[PDB]
Amino acid sequence: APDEITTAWPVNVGPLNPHLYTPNQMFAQSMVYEPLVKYQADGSVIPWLAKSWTHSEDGKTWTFTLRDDVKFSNGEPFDAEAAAENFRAVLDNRQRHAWLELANQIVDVKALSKTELQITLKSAYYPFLQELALPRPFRFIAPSQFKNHETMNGIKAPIGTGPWILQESKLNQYDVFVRNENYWGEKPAIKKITFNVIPDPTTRAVAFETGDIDLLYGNEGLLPLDTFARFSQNPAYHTQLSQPIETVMLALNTAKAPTNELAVREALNYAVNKKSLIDNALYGTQQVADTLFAPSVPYANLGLKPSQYDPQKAKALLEKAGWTLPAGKDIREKNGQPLRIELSFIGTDALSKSMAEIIQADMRQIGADVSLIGEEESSIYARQRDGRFGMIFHRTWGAPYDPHAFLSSMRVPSHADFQAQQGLADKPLIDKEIGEVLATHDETQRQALYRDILTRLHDEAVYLPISYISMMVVSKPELGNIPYAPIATEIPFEQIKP
Ligand SMILES: O=C(O)CN(CCN(CC(=O)O)Cc1cccc(O)c1O)Cc1ccccc1O
Ligand SMILES: [Fe+3]
């Protein structure tokens, strides 16, 4: 049918518990569940399930006036009691939301009436509203669908207030969504969306070619980039490539030899020809990055100095630090130790592998021996949490997480960023400033704090920025132009209009 589309995803959508993480897929959570306030491209929020709000002070106390016409898809009312119950369900699982600072900040949530919801905070936390706009955890399921008055141990039916309803879900096969005919807002033009489960990139491309699917929408791993370029020239298809949404980079372990040495980290930051990496591995479809956050990111236009590809300077830095070439060898040594660094990545990911081979080659030219460790997903995530790496592939989180939520999470010990930064003498100071910047109201101090944090991270060469990557689209021409959502992980199916 013509108001029915078929697309694909590498895995199923999950149970669609609005308050939990893996294996729930964010974009699908955002299809079913809705926030109090909705994020926009300009960086503000607009009213959503909450039609208005006031704050005290000195903002520790916020009072939201909720809409009074909203129903969950099962007929039950959305009201302040329903909302307060959801905040309780999430904060009963507080430990698991450590990465998100609002979760440590909420002191209390209570329904003052049916339409009045009061939320009090530990301090005047500036990104309050943006964090409420996230896909998860602060979105609302029907409280009748809690299991014994909680969500952290599972839910019953995934009943949201959103424009889409999960119809059917078959493990390792497909997920089917259907339009909410009783939605409080704008009715979407599409009536039915089918997600076929296709874990392999080339298989996804083939499925589009044979006509089995109408739409692919994702990041740089969506399909092979050479196939994408070919598709963009094929008059029978439609393709798109957005403006960059986030950064892809290596994180270097400042706590582990030999990346513990500033001079070594600086040298590595001159070793990679990033344009060539991009033209070679990413088929020219992405942009070079010479900084943890692109100059376009809020608070991140700082005139930071790039380290341009310069093997001559890389070698000089290494020689000066005492990493010199022994007789007939190509690998530097210092104290008898070789300049050896492990680069760990997901071994099944062909793009990572490609990029890692290029990185390994470039670094060999300046006399560093990069050893490639490709392992399964769990092993890699286990490495990121324990600091068991020399270098790893990492990325930022895009809007609305960048830069505040990304820096926030640098303070959490079981994250890759904390671990990479562990060896820095000024790490306690940086973590303290991250805490300050999030609670500050003085705009000039806020800017000064971001500058100091990002500058120290740049100068200490914690990262090796690689590119700023884009969203991509392949579609049947009949679907028309495919819009992008403000939040990088969401897919605006509601806005597709054949
Ligand atoms: O990704 C992390 O470091 C931790 N996550 C917190 C930060 N997440 C936002 C989010 O997940 O809501 C940032 C995030 C941002 C964009 C895309 C993502 O896939 C993504 O995860 C939570 C998490 C826990 C357990 C398994 C997977 C997870 O993502
Ligand atoms: Fe996450």
Rounded to 5°, the CA angle 11-15-18 comes to 110
Mutate to test the pocket of ligand 1, among 397, 415, 418 (most ligand atoms within 8 A of CB): 397
Question: Is residue 40 within 8 Å of residue 486, measured between CB atoms?
Answer: yes
Q: Give how far Cα 331 sits from Cα of 75, 247, 257, 262, Å.
A: 69, 30, 16, 19
SS3 418: helix
Which contiguous run of DSSP H or E holds residue 208?
A: helix 201-209
Task: Give me ligand 1 centre to Cα 400, in Å.
Answer: 13
Phi, psi (5° rounding) for residue 257? -60, 140
Note the ligand closest to the C-alpha atom of 488: 1
Q: Report the C-alpha gap between 132 and 138 in whole angstroms.
A: 6
SS3 234: coil
Phi, psi (5° rounding) for residue 311? -60, -35
- Ligand 1 atom 20: residue of nearest CA: 397
Q: Roughly what angle, to the nearest 10 degrees, separates helices 311-320 and 262-271?
A: 160
Question: Is residue 287 within 8 Å of residue 220, measured between CB atoms?
Answer: no
Mutate to test the pocket of ligand 1, among 11, 13, 19, 21 (most ligand atoms within 8 A of CB): 21
Let me know how many helices (H) and strands (E) the chain has, helices first. Answer: 15, 21
SS3 content of the chain, % helix, strand, coil (to 5): 30, 25, 45
Q: Report the C-alpha gap between 172 and 169 in whole angstroms.
A: 9
Query: Which atom of ligand 1 is found nearest the CA of 134?
Result: 12
Both tokens of 9, joined, read 């995803």
Mutate to test the pocket of ligand 1, among 489, 490, 491 (most ligand atoms within 8 A of CB): 489
Mutate to test the pocket of ligand 1, among 9, 17, 26 (most ligand atoms within 8 A of CB): 26
The resolution in Å comes to: 2.3
Both tokens of 387, joined, read 């600091």
Largest CA distance in the chain: 80
Q: Give how far Cα 280 sits from Cα of 4, 226, 275, 286, 347, Å.
A: 38, 10, 8, 11, 19
Fold of 1-242+471-498: D-Maltodextrin-Binding Protein; domain 2 (3.40.190)
Which contiguous run of DSSP H or E holds residue 277?
A: helix 274-281
Q: Give how far Cα 371 sits from Cα of 342, 364, 389, 392, 423, Å.
A: 5, 10, 11, 12, 21
Give the DSSP per-residue string, 334-376. ETTEE-EEEEEEETT-HHHHHHHHHHHHHHHHTT-EEEEEEE-
The alpha carbon of 441 is separated from its chain's Cα centroid by a whole number of angstroms, namely 26
Question: Is residue 155 within 8 Å of residue 17, measured between CB atoms?
Answer: yes
Mutate to test the pocket of ligand 1, among 30, 90, 99, 102 (most ligand atoms within 8 A of CB): 99
Q: Report the C-alpha gap between 287 and 271 in whole angstroms.
A: 18
Query: Which atom of ligand 1 is found nearest the CA of 401?
Result: 15
First-residue to last-residue Cα distance in the chain: 12
Beta strand 340-346 pairing with 369-375: parallel
Task: Give me ligand 2 centre to Cα 298, in Å.
Answer: 21
Q: Give how far Cα 298 sits from Cα of 293, 407, 457, Å.
A: 9, 13, 16
Question: Is residue 478 within 8 Å of residue 19, measured between CB atoms?
Answer: no
Residue 137, preceding bond cis, omega within 30 degrees? Answer: yes
Note the ligand closest to the C-alpha atom of 14: 1
Q: Report the C-alpha gap between 26 and 70 in whole angstroms.
A: 23
Both tokens of 128, joined, read 């309050």
Phi, psi (5° rounding) for residue 486? -50, -45
DSSP letter at 75 equals S
Which contiguous run of DSSP H or E holds residue 453?
A: helix 443-459
- Ligand 1 atom 4: residue of nearest CA: 99
Q: Report the C-alpha gap between 272 and 368 in whole angstroms.
A: 12
Query: Which atom of ligand 1 is found nearest the CA of 246?
Result: 16
Q: Roughly what angle, to the nearest 10 degrees, separates helices 350-365 and 274-281?
A: 140
Rounded to 5°, the CA angle 226-228-230 comes to 70
Residues 6+ apart with CB under 8 A from 451: 299, 302
Name which CATH class applies to 243-470.
alpha beta
Phi-psi region of 144 (alpha: psi -120 to 50; beta: other; left: phi over 0): alpha
Beta strand 238-252 pairing with 369-375: unpaired
Phi-psi region of 464 (alpha: psi -120 to 50; beta: other; left: phi over 0): beta
Q: Give how far Cα 432 sits from Cα of 149, 161, 326, 453, Å.
A: 37, 39, 43, 10
Task: Give me ligand 2 centre to Cα 242, in Å.
Answer: 22
* Residue labelled with tokens 């009748």: 144
Task: Give me ligand 2 centre to Cα 55, in Å.
Answer: 29
The alpha carbon of 331 is separated from its chain's Cα centroid by a whole number of angstroms, namely 36
Task: Give me ligand 2 centre to Cα 25, in Å.
Answer: 10
458 forms bridges with which residues in the sheet?
none
Q: Residue 447, Cβ neighbours under 10 Å: how many?
A: 15
Rounded to 5°, the CA angle 105-83-103 comes to 15
In this structure, the chain runs to a length of 498
Both tokens of 482, joined, read 């495919």
Q: List b or e across 338-352, with b for residues whose CB sees 16 or more CB atoms inside 10 angstroms.
A: bbebbbbbbbebebb
Question: Is residue 133 within 8 Å of residue 1, measured between CB atoms?
Answer: no
* Residue labelled with tokens 């909420």: 106
SS3 28: helix
Q: Report the C-alpha gap between 127 and 401 in whole angstroms.
A: 10
Reference 192, options 165, 160, 159; nearest CA is: 165
- Ligand 1 atom 12: residue of nearest CA: 136
Both tokens of 395, joined, read 């990325």
Residues having CB closer than 6 A to ligand 1 are 21-22, 26, 99, 136, 397-398, 401, 415, 489
Question: Is residue 407 within 8 Å of residue 292, measured between CB atoms?
Answer: no
Q: Roughly what angle, to the nearest 10 degrees, separates helices 427-439 and 443-459?
A: 150
Note the ligand closest to the C-alpha atom of 385: 1
Query: Which atom of ligand 1 is found nearest the CA of 135?
Result: 12
Residues 6+ apart with CB under 8 A from 336: none
Q: In what order do the strands lie in the sheet with 116-121?
A: 50-55, 61-66, 116-121, 106-111
Note the ligand closest to the C-alpha atom of 29: 1
* Residue labelled with tokens 């949201």: 160
Reference 183, options 24, 16, 49; nearest CA is: 49
Both tokens of 91, joined, read 């904060």
- Ligand 1 atom 8: residue of nearest CA: 397
237 forms bridges with which residues in the sheet?
none
Q: Report the C-alpha gap between 158 and 17 in whole angstroms.
A: 6
Q: Residue 14, Cβ neighbours under 10 Å: how many?
A: 18
Q: Roughly what angle, to the nearest 10 degrees, separates helices 262-271 and 350-365?
A: 110
- Structural domain boundaries of the chain? 1-242+471-498, 243-470
Both tokens of 335, joined, read 């104290």
Residues 6+ apart with CB under 8 A from 259: 252, 253, 265, 268, 341, 390, 391
Phi, psi (5° rounding) for residue 234? -85, 115
Q: Report the C-alpha gap between 418 and 296 in whole angstroms.
A: 25
Q: Report the C-alpha gap between 180 and 368 in whole angstroms.
A: 57
